[PDB]
RNA sequence: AGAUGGUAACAUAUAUAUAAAUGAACUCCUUUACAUAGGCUUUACACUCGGGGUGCGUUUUCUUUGCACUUUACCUUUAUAACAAACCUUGGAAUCAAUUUACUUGGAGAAGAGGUUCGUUGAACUCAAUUCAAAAAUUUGUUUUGUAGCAAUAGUAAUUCGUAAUUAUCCGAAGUGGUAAGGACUAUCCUUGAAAAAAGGAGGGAACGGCUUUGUGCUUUGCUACUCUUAAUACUUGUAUGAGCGUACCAACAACCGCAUCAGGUCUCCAAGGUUAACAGCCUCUGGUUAAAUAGAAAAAAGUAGGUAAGGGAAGUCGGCAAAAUAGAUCCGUAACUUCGGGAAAAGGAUUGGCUCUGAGGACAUUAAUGUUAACUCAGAACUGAAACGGACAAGGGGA
RNA sequence: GAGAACUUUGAAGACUGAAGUGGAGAAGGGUUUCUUGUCAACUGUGAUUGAACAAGAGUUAGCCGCUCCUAAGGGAUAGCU
RNA sequence: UCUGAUGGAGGAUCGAGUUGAUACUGACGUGCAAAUCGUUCAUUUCAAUCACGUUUAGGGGCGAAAGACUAAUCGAAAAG
């Protein structure tokens, strides 16, 4: 809820970071995307 | 917040070196009423003088190192 | 899309969105107001008005 | 006007529960709820607080007694024997 | 106690005729439930630009305003005029915007 | 070397700030700390009513009108006032008294008279101050202030002027009892309704001023500002004030679990007006929406959720299933049988609107008469209407 | 706006009717919040909308909690098995 | 020995909500739904209801007893 453990918060942050799409420039030298409503983190 | 009634007490408080600021407020009464506020480090002491001239006199008396706030 | 502006107006005034009148003339001007200060200004001008309360008369 | 004829204190139970059982309860209820004579102050103010505890409103003294009556006959007999001894 | 109406702004635009207004006021002013009174309890006089009401009885400035509004409604001056308080004893007509 | 008052209950340090009322070991308590039900009271918010003040609304007609705003936080042991208790002093009670809605209490000391305290409450009370005039070693009389300070400088409703500033408003009466809390109580129990951290009080009486000199922390000798206590400050010692973590948003209506943006499920608090017994149902204000995996046009059958049907009235059917009828309240009337408590709202009747009246029920405060004035509830009588009235909503079918 | 019954604004008419699709919270969720964009798919119709996609941005406490205490209980110390 | 009050007792009565699930064997039955919806109904001061915490684990537990339930799984769970 609105009162999380610090560790949990960190995990959430990490997940969020993971979520973001490939920086496009790489493509010139993702399958693991997630949606908060369809696949749960099961934390 | 504290109210004061002994003029002498008020004076004493003023004389005391933790008193950085003073406030003087004017209020149209339902004549000109005047509130004298002293702001001490721990309390804000206030005296209500119904009589303008007296209030003025007391203000004059107040140390000229006080950082006087004229609110209205 | 005046949504946001309406929301801002609601908070600023203390009234519900159901009660902000945004004038259909000068919808361009209003949409430009992306801030609370701007909303306030608009209100002052009279481009945003607090609607009058629906009446509940005790008379009967 | 006196409400109940034979029922008395067991009017709270109403129609339910065997009549015989209710009759027995009545005696016991009477025993319970009667203000007993305190053997200290003299005022009939000793009332039942718990199962075997009887407190007086006067002295605030809690006297241990029987479950329903302040003194069971056996206990009294025992006391008497002790006194005689 | 004196109550005033600074009727200038629309009186000087002709649209407000003080004489009619005075009459209306006289007509209207109920006294403990009846219009035809206006005895020793209330007096109404008029300058060129000002109506004066003087009351001995419990009387509300609100009432005067209401009367004015009614008058305005009667003579179609509703989108043009407004009753506004100046001083406590002093009401005044003001132009709508 | 360790205050005082008060007969007593107990009170007292108001210094910027009630800081300070010696106290060790070792104990003893108390707070923390407690069920449920019932009413009663007090406060609070909420709602309402009447008036004044502002702005808006209605105005063919009518309406001193309808609506809106009129605000006030913690904190100051807040100061006091008021009240339910508990206690103290006096007093001495049968012709029993005081007393609550209820009973409770009283020679183990009641009533009464004066007090003390805790608790509600948080500016009530003249509360404080001021204006001066009289009486002792400070008290009485009058006035002006203050939304008691916080506090108006903040809000809110206005009105302007300008391209943010000024101004004016902010307050006199009361009722309803819907919430919530407290209080004193009362009742129920083969049910008697947590603990500790932490804090406080008490008993108890260990220890005992400082400095200098001499002898081996202890003893002797001389001198008098000392022991406390807050706050401030200066200086060394590690840098002598506030560690870390959580804080978006959703809480289902599409953010959760139901494989999904699924009519399901999922804990808690706040809770307006009308009608009313009602936080029911029906409608409305504040707030919220006007959306829901679709629209439009036609309006057959059939379906589904409903309505309504003449005369009959269960003849339908396994069976009165379903539906209808019944229903609220007041007044009457109430059997068999019974464990005497019930049955029972038995059964069965009657009444009900609107309007206009009449009677019944208080609080104060003047001197038995005269006043100011408050709810709502009863009871009765006219008149009235297409014989209607718990007009919608809501609401037992009954019996043998 | 290319394009609008389901984006936005106004005007109606309506409903929710303080046991509310109103405010706050808990569990659970985890960036869904917000702004600027924005429409490949998704948003079972459309869609310029969006809880979608993209870029950023956003959660500040001595006093609100956790943090301390104990409760039902749990994990262990000594043993003993 | 009666009568009028008061009093507010009760696993009393009706009854919203809540917890349930009686009937329609109504709707739905390639549903909104792997049990829902509607109307009706039973329950509401106690053997009440709910939350969170916690205890008890598979030939075991838990059971006001239906072989009920023990994560859509039960006359012996599930996983390997
Ligand atoms: Mg959580
Ligand atoms: Mg999900
Ligand atoms: Mg102001
Ligand atoms: Mg938040
Ligand atoms: Mg927010
Ligand atoms: Mg849903
Ligand atoms: Mg799943
Ligand atoms: Mg949907
Ligand atoms: Mg027929
Ligand atoms: Mg028949
Ligand atoms: Mg037949
Ligand atoms: Mg047949
Ligand atoms: Mg039937
Ligand atoms: Mg759609
Ligand atoms: Mg409605
Ligand atoms: Mg409805
Ligand atoms: Mg919402
Ligand atoms: Mg968003
Ligand atoms: Mg689509
Ligand atoms: Mg957007
Ligand atoms: Mg995204
Ligand atoms: Mg705290
Ligand atoms: Mg510990
Ligand atoms: Mg334990
Ligand atoms: Mg173990
Ligand atoms: Mg069944
Ligand atoms: Mg069926
Ligand atoms: Mg079908
Ligand atoms: Mg069997
Ligand atoms: Zn006794």
From Swiss-Prot, chain D:
<comment type="subunit">
    <text>Component of the large ribosomal subunit. Mature ribosomes consist of a small (40S) and a large (60S) subunit. The 40S subunit contains about 32 different proteins and 1 molecule of RNA (18S). The 60S subunit contains about 42 different proteins and 3 molecules of RNA (28S, 5.8S and 5S).</text>
</comment>
<keyword id="KW-0862">Zinc</keyword>
<dbReference type="GO" id="GO:0008270">
    <property type="term" value="F:zinc ion binding"/>
</dbReference>
<keyword id="KW-0963">Cytoplasm</keyword>
<dbReference type="GO" id="GO:0003735">
    <property type="term" value="F:structural constituent of ribosome"/>
</dbReference>
<comment type="function">
    <text>Component of the ribosome, a large ribonucleoprotein complex responsible for the synthesis of proteins in the cell. The small ribosomal subunit (SSU) binds messenger RNAs (mRNAs) and translates the encoded message by selecting cognate aminoacyl-transfer RNA (tRNA) molecules. The large subunit (LSU) contains the ribosomal catalytic site termed the peptidyl transferase center (PTC), which catalyzes the formation of peptide bonds, thereby polymerizing the amino acids delivered by tRNAs into a polypeptide chain.</text>
</comment>
<dbReference type="GO" id="GO:0022626">
    <property type="term" value="C:cytosolic ribosome"/>
</dbReference>
<keyword id="KW-0689">Ribosomal protein</keyword>
<dbReference type="GO" id="GO:0006412">
    <property type="term" value="P:translation"/>
</dbReference>
<dbReference type="InterPro" id="IPR050522">
    <property type="entry name" value="Ribosomal_protein_eL43"/>
</dbReference>
<keyword id="KW-0479">Metal-binding</keyword>
<feature type="zinc finger region" description="C4-type">
    <location>
        <begin position="38"/>
        <end position="59"/>
    </location>
</feature>
<dbReference type="InterPro" id="IPR002674">
    <property type="entry name" value="Ribosomal_eL43"/>
</dbReference>
<keyword id="KW-0863">Zinc-finger</keyword>
<dbReference type="InterPro" id="IPR011331">
    <property type="entry name" value="Ribosomal_eL37/eL43"/>
</dbReference>
<protein>
    <recommendedName>
        <fullName>Large ribosomal subunit protein eL43</fullName>
    </recommendedName>
</protein>
<keyword id="KW-0687">Ribonucleoprotein</keyword>
<dbReference type="InterPro" id="IPR011332">
    <property type="entry name" value="Ribosomal_zn-bd"/>
</dbReference>
<dbReference type="GO" id="GO:1990904">
    <property type="term" value="C:ribonucleoprotein complex"/>
</dbReference>
<dbReference type="Pfam" id="PF01780">
    <property type="entry name" value="Ribosomal_L37ae"/>
</dbReference>
<comment type="similarity">
    <text>Belongs to the eukaryotic ribosomal protein eL43 family.</text>
</comment>
């Amino acid at each position: 809820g609105s009162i999380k453990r610090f560790r949990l918060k960190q995990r959430l942050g990490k997940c969020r970071r993971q979520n973001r799409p490939v920086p496009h420039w790489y493509r010139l030298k993702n399958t693991k995307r997630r949606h908060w409503r369809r696949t749960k983190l099961g934390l | 917040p504290k109210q004061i009634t002994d003029i002498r007490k008020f004076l004493k408080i003023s004389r005391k070196p933790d008193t950085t600021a003073v406030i003087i407020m004017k209020k149209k009464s339902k004549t000109v009423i005047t509130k004298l506020k002293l702001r001490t480090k721990k309390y804000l002491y206030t005296m209500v003088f119904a009589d303008r001239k007296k209030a003025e006199r007391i203000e004059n008396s107040l140390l000229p190192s006080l950082k006087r706030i004229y609110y209205p | 899309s005046l949504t946001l502006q309406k929301r801002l107006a609601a908070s600023v005034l203390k009234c519900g969105k159901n009660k902000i009148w945004m004038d259909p003339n000068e919808i361009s001007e209003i949409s430009l107001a992306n801030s609370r200060f701007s909303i306030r200004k608009l209100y002052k001008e009279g481009l945003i008005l607090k609607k009058p309360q629906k009446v509940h008369s005790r008379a009967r | 006007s006196r409400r109940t004829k034979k029922v008395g204190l067991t009017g709270k139970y109403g129609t339910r529960y065997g009549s015989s059982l209710r009759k027995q309860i009545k005696k016991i209820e009477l025993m319970q709820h009667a203000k007993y004579l305190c053997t200290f102050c003299g005022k009939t103010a000793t009332k039942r607080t718990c199962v075997g505890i009887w407190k007086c409103k006067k002295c605030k003294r809690k006297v241990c007694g029987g479950a329903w009556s302040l003194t069971t006959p056996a206990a009294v007999a025992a006391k008497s024997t002790i006194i005689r001894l | 106690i004196k109550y005033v109406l600074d009727c200038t702004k629309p009186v000087k635009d002709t649209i407000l005729d003080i004489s009619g207004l005075e009459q209306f006021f006289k007509d209207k002013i109920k006294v403990d439930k009846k219009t035809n009174n206006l005895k020793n309890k209330v007096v109404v006089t008029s300058d060129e630009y000002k109506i004066y009401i003087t009351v001995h009885i419990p009387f509300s400035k609100r009432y005067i305003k209401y009367l004015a509004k009614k008058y305005i409604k009667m003579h179609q001056i509703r989108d043009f005029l407004r009753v506004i308080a100046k001083g406590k004893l002093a009401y005044e007509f003001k132009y709508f915007q």
